[PDB]
Design a protein around this ligand. Sequence first.
Ligand code: NA
Length: 183
Amino acid sequence: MRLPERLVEAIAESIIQKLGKEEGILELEDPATFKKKIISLFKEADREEKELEEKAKAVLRENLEVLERENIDYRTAFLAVKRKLAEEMNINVDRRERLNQIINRIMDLIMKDESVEIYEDPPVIRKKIREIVLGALKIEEEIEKTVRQRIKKYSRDLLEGSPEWQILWKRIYEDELKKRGLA
Ligand code: NA
């Protein structure tokens, strides 16, 4: 589950408020563009995950006879093929390590941006941005936990994991985002 866009926006706003305005270790000429670039970074990371999934599907589609002949469940093969392609594409499949790659890309953006100056050792900036991103991940985890609790109510007449269940999950998720101002 990716971070919703308004939470990604909140990450960027938090970098500006804490590291810029409260601690003064970061200075930016253009906060709105800085936010835009961080949002693009998270969008691009999602585009990479989609490409990985489509590439994994395409590899499986050309090897269906292998799965049948060698008795390899499609679901197991997909996960294994996806992991291998991820290694080749340098995509970490754990959500946390993926976000860590994203923190490095944020640092790359900050350090290569001529309208940005930093008044601390770059790794110090990196660790503070990591704390902020982790904060957003903890919010997303708390939202997801609430969704799971709310959807359990419908266990009696709904198949857990069915397409309807997944759509209902997303509707409850959007409701929770609205209750927190994130949609
Ligand atoms: Na068989």
